[PDB]
């Protein structure tokens, strides 16, 4: 059985190899830290072909990325996020998948956040969920192909809202309403939106709110010409 291979590989082929990606691979922890590209999506698919084989034991999935591309850099394609979505969607009845949001999740990283099993999706206290509008701003080529590029950008927003409504159990027209502007999402209210199931809290809460800053200042007199000094706290 493969549990004796787990104790033998960590002695010879995983331990004295100093790479942290190998030791994380043996503990059934698959972490997406790099921005998604042609090298990341084939590496995430190749690790999923191995994990479904040895055991039906649950796998931990951590998401910490800015998606595929930042808004201040070169843009690519958005089809590789669906390829890792549909690959991990069929695993849920074969293997339990635990998904937790660490750091940030820009754009397509929130699509894999809702791709986890129901009752196992989670996020941290200061996470950030972004419903960005993707992708491919470059359209400077021949005008005979832009009419089929209007078909591409319309049907890709349709299947992205269809896959998001299948997990969040919401209406598809509400997904395109959040696609008009880059609206950020608080994880405390994301449980009501349907993206995550719960929010894991630390053992000692020391994040004091800022609602006690409002000291209740009185209204000024009507016969006082107020200055135009800028609001700086």
């Amino acid at each position: 059985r493969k549990l004796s291979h787990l104790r033998k590989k960590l002695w010879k082929e995983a331990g004295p190899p100093p790479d942290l990606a190998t030791r994380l691979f043996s503990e059934r922890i698959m972490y997406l830290g790099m921005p998604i590209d042609s090298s990341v999506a084939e590496l995430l698919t190749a690790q999923l072909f191995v994990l479904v084989q040895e055991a039906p034991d649950p796998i931990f999935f951590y998401i910490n990325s800015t998606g595929i591309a930042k808004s201040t850099t070169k843009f690519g394609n958005e089809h590789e996020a669906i390829a890792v979505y549909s690959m991990m969607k069929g695993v849920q009845k074969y293997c339990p998948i635990y998904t937790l949001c660490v750091g940030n999740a820009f754009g397509e990283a929130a699509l894999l956040l809702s791709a986890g099993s129901p009752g196992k999706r989670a996020a941290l206290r200061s996470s950030t969920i972004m419903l960005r509008q993707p992708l491919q701003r470059l359209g400077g080529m021949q005008a005979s192909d832009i009419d089929i590029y209007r078909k591409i950008t319309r049907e890709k927003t349709a299947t992205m809202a269809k896959y998001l409504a299948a997990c969040t159990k919401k209406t598809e027209e509400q997904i395109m309403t959040d696609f008009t502007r880059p609206r950020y999402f608080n994880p405390y209210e994301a449980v009501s939106y349907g993206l995550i199931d719960t929010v894991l809290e630390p053992k000692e809460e020391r994040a004091v709110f800022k609602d006690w800053e409002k000291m209740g200042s009185e209204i000024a007199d009507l016969g006082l010409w107020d200055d135009e000094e800028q609001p700086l706290p």
């Binding site: 135009e228 000094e229 800028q230 700086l232």
Partner: protein, 193 residues
């Protein structure tokens, strides 16, 4: 840049130079400041009693170039009436505030920005504290003359010009930057009842 527009731009500033209108060209650096002080020291040949119209439009610039324009505006015999159209920077609004008291005119659609002047420092350890002292000396002189022009206190200028502070001439007339606004009287419109 297009070289065809240069002779058209040189023609319209020379025709306004006969009508005693000067121009602040772009950022204030050394090449235009010697050209601008040559224009204020030439308009007194026709008459030294009538006012001087100054078109003010500058998006930034250095510190010592704008100080060479500031001292000659308050030294010559005719009054210098500054006119800010468009956008005035921290050195541009200081030129606008350095005009004659009661003759600083503008339009209520401009933007007035005042802050401490930009700068840098490079060298050894004692070179840093030397070049930082002249910036703070330029901080005290720019905030000191603005306290005398606007009539405010010393603490009021340093706490408002600490960062980027954009104003409108509707509210700059209450602080003391612009003395009066220039706008034609509009016809009253039939509003809804």
């Amino acid at each position: 840049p297009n070289p065809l527009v240069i002779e058209r731009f040189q023609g319209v500033v020379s025709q306004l130079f006969q009508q005693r209108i000067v121009r602040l060209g772009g950022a204030v650096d050394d090449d235009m400041a010697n050209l601008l002080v040559a224009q204020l020291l030439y308009l007194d040949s026709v008459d030294n009693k009538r006012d001087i119209t100054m078109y003010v439009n500058s998006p930034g610039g250095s510190v010592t170039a704008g100080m060479a324009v500031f001292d000659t505006m308050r030294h010559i015999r005719p009054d210098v009436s500054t006119c800010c159209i468009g956008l005035a920077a921290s050195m541009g609004a200081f030129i606008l505030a350095s005009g004659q008291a009661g003759k600083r005119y503008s339009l209520p659609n401009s933007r007035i920005m005042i802050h401490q002047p930009l700068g840098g420092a490079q060298g050894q350890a004692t070179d840093i504290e030397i070049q930082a002292n002249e910036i703070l000396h330029h901080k005290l002189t720019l905030n000191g003359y603005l306290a005398q022009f606007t009539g405010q206190s010393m603490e009021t200028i340093t706490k408002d010009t600490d960062r980027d502070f954009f104003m409108s001439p509707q509210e700059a007339i209450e602080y003391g930057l612009v003395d009066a606004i220039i706008s034609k009287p509009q016809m009253l419109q039939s509003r809804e009842v």
